[PDB]
Amino acid sequence: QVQLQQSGPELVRPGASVKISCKASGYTFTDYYINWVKQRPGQGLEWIGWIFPRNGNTKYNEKFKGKATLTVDKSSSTAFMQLSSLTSEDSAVYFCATTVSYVMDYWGQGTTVTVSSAKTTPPSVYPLAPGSATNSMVTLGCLVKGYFPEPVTVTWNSGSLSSGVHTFPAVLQSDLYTLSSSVTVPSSTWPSETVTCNVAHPASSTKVDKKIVPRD
Amino acid sequence: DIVMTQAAFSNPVTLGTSASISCRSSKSLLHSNGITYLYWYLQRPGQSPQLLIYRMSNLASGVPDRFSGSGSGTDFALRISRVEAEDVGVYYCGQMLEHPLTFGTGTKLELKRADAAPTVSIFPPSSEQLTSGGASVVCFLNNFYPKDINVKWKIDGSERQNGVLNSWTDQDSKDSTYSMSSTLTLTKDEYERHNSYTCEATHKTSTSPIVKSFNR
Amino acid sequence: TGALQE
Structure with missing residues (x-):
């Protein structure tokens, strides 16, 4: 019954500012502190500050000086956190955690703010086929190169060949992401049968089917 | 600022076995009231944090009984009686004694293979x-x-x-x-x-x- | 602080 619905995924340009919402339901909104935490892929959970809905009192972590500004809309049982003057150092997930009985015993969805100046670019999907083909098992793969922003959904044979696949985390090289996916199948089944990776990238509305074919 | 030090990964745990995750605080977390304000949060892959232990040794309603928490002064530990697959995720300890609230880098619970x-x-x-x-x-x-x-x-x-x-x-x-x-x-x-x-x-x-x- | 929020 107690739920906190945070705003959705955000992509913003350096310089700009973002407002994340956190709508509450299930308890009297006005009487409980709402904490904001920041989680960056390479750090721990960093506490931004809290706000008391009733009288809008507010305390921040010096480190989030004039970066974060917490506000509240009593009439929507909604809390907002606004980050201004955005920098790539602000790319992170931003949770809102209320303390109902014990400190941050109810957490928000964990929105994902991404700050980049990059333009939506379509992924270049190249097939990764075995060099000189010995063994009994064969590993093929796909390279989803230079795309932005995240994410991209990879599947093999429309998903049926989901057996022993491995889709690796994307890496950022010159403002563009690049991930690779490998799929392992029996030799008797390739080139015997076809193996195809399905790369989808919503942002750019592209969808590519790569037929894994033998080299030349 | 109070500092919390955790390891990156827990010692490998064979399912069904027992496991414990450590955490040290750069200062005593005991308060005039006799409560030691150390908290434990678990973040299962693809989810929001969840409060597990509060005030060093207390279980949060809903948490399994095989999750206990102890500590001596500035040294704490979260213990999992018999680890179930569902228990995998990153564990963060948090000091709620004084502002700013601060957490440890979190410890990833690895499994023995x-x-x-x-x-x-x-x-x-x-x-x-x-x-x-x-x-x-x-x-x-x-x-x-x-x-x-x-x-x-x-x-x-x-x-x-x-x-x-x-x-x-x-x-x-x-x-x-x-x-x-x-x-x-x-x-x-x-x-x-x-x-x-x-x-x-x-x-x-x-x-x-x-x-x-x-x-x- | 938990001594304030709880």
Whole structure:
């Protein structure tokens, strides 16, 4: 019954500012502190500050000086956190955690703010086929190169060949992401049968089917 | 600022076994009221944090009984009676004694696996990318254990550090295994100026680096 | 602080 619905995924340009919402339901909104935490892929959970809905009192972590500004809309049982003057150092997930009985015993969805100046670019999907083909098992793969922003959904044979696949985390090289996916199948089944990776990238509305074919 | 130090990963735990995660605070977390304000939060892959233990030793309604928490002054520990798969995630300890609230880097609970060697495969730049005027050589090291692994790229018997990009999967949910993807991106021209490309993996399972390579 | 929020 107690739920906190945070705003959705955000992509913003350096310089700009973002407002994340956190709508509450299930308890009297006005009487409980709402904490904001920041989680960056390479750090721990960093506490931004809290706000008391009733009288809008507010305390921040010096480190989030004039970066974060917490506000509240009593009439929507909604809390907002606004980050201004955005920098790539602000790319992170931003949770809102209320303390109902014990400190941050109810957490928000964990929105994902991404700050980049990059333009939506379509992924270049190249097939990764075995060099000189010995063994009994064969590993093929796909390279989803230079795309932005995240994410991209990879599947093999429309998903049926989901057996022993491995889709690796994307890496950022010159403002563009690049991930690779490998799929392992029996030799008797390739080139015997076809193996195809399905790369989808919503942002750019592209969808590519790569037929894994033998080299030349 | 009070500092909280956690390890990156817990000692490998065989399912059904017992496990404990440590955490030290740069200062006593005891309060005039006799409550030690140390808290425990678990973040299961693909989820929001969840409060597990509050005030050092108390369980939060809903948490399983096999989760206990103790500590001496500035030293704490979260103990899991019999670890269930569902218990995998990253554990963060948090000091709620004074502002700013601060957490530890979090500890990833690793599972014990029987040593597994790296299944290495190397792949030549695709025919299509070679048209984009670029050529990247991808090399997969999948299903290995323990996690610590090292990979060096060689071009005609001479290592090359530049142009290499790495990605690492998290411990699998069925293998308790680890995998890695390396990518050496060169110019179509630089690529064609040499003939032998080798991908070497140095892992604990073997004495000799595992060697996969290809030429022209 | 938990001594304030709880």
